[PDB]
Amino acid sequence: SGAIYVGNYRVVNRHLATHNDWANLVWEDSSRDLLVSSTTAQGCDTIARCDCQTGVYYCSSRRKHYPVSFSKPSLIFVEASEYYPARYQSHLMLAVGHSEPGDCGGILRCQHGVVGIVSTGGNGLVGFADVRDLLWLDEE
Numbered sequence: 476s477g478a479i480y481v482g483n484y485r486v487v488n489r490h491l492a493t494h495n496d497w498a499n500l501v502w503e504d505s506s507r508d509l510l511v512s513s514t515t516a517q518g519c520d521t522i523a524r525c526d527c528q529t530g531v532y533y534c535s536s537r538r539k540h541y542p543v544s545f546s547k548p549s550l551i552f553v554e555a556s557e558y559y560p561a562r563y564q565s566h567l568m569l570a571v572g573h574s575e576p577g578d579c580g581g582i583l584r585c586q587h588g589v590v591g592i593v594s595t596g597g598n599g600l601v602g603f604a605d606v607r608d609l610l611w612l613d614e615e
């Protein structure tokens with residue numbers, strides 16, 4: 476589980492979005508596993524605006540923050556899960572690291588702020604949904 480809180484926006488894994496998230500939906504993209512809902516109060520997380528390929532993510536399944544290299548966001552084939560059938564996930568970054576279904580929502584951060592959230596796993600590789608192209612999160 477886990478969310479980014481920037482301005483009056485809340486960014487979650489589409490598959491872990493609540494009734495209130497959908498009820499207060501701003502934007503979702505199933506192919507990205509992303510959803511943004513409107514929030515009553517202001518968030519404090521800074522979104523990275525950068526082409527960083529190194530950072531630290533939180534892995535709840537190890538209660539540990541792992542420094543990682545990660546690939547640039549790309550269209551990648553992701554095997555079937557509880558929430559999506561075997562499909563091509565867009566805006567996805569891969570690193571070598573541990574990832575279990577419940578690690579979705581763990582933040583990936585570089586020196587600039589939040590790069591994305593854990594979205595995929597398996598075969599000793601963690602996948603993060605990029606949010607750095609969503610410029611509109613830094614305004615209204």
Ligand SMILES: Cc1cc(C)c(NC(=O)CO)c(C)c1
Nearest residue numbers: 555556575576579595596597
């Ligand atoms: C955090 C996380 C971990 C794993 C193993 C998976 N599974 C897949 O990659 C697809 O089957 C998903 C969706 C999320």
Ligand SMILES: [Zn+2]
Nearest residue numbers: 525527585587
């Ligand atoms: Zn950066």
